[PDB]
From Swiss-Prot:
Cytochrome b5 is a membrane-bound hemoprotein functioning as an electron carrier for several membrane-bound oxygenases. Keywords: Acetylation, Electron transport, Endoplasmic reticulum, Heme, Iron, Membrane, Metal-binding, Microsome, Transmembrane, Transmembrane helix, Transport. GO terms for cellular component: endoplasmic reticulum; endoplasmic reticulum membrane; intracellular membrane-bounded organelle; membrane. This is Cytochrome b5. It is a single-pass membrane protein. Residues 4-80 form the Cytochrome b5 heme-binding domain. Heme binds at H39, H63.
Amino acid sequence: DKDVKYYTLEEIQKHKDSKSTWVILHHKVYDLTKFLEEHPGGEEVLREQAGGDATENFEDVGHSTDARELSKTYIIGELHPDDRSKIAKPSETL
Ligand code: HEM
């Protein structure tokens, strides 16, 4: 623990508390808690999904490369290797 910051999908799916909004863009866990307002776009767009693959939205817009490398500066952790190494098809319902 407290090294690489490896978090599992379901674990990250429990990071949407009050003032704890995480997002796993691509295969990297970014903490945007202190970026909700700072984000030149807003908080709600950040707090829309949270704790999950927000790449869908992120890429829906694409973002500039400036923001891409910025993600790295906001990298807190990464998707658990057990999962990432063998991308398992996530469950869903509706
Ligand atoms: C790594 C995390 C993120 C960073 C560092 C980031 C950074 C930025 C930056 C710098 C811009 C300004 C435009 C540009 O220069 O490209 C921007 C705009 C924007 N971002 Fe993000 N962003 C992040 C995640 C997200 C996510 C996941 C969403 C959606 C769920 C989002 C939605 C938007 C929208 C909508 C705008 C433009 C506002 C508008 O025209 O409505 N961003 N972002």
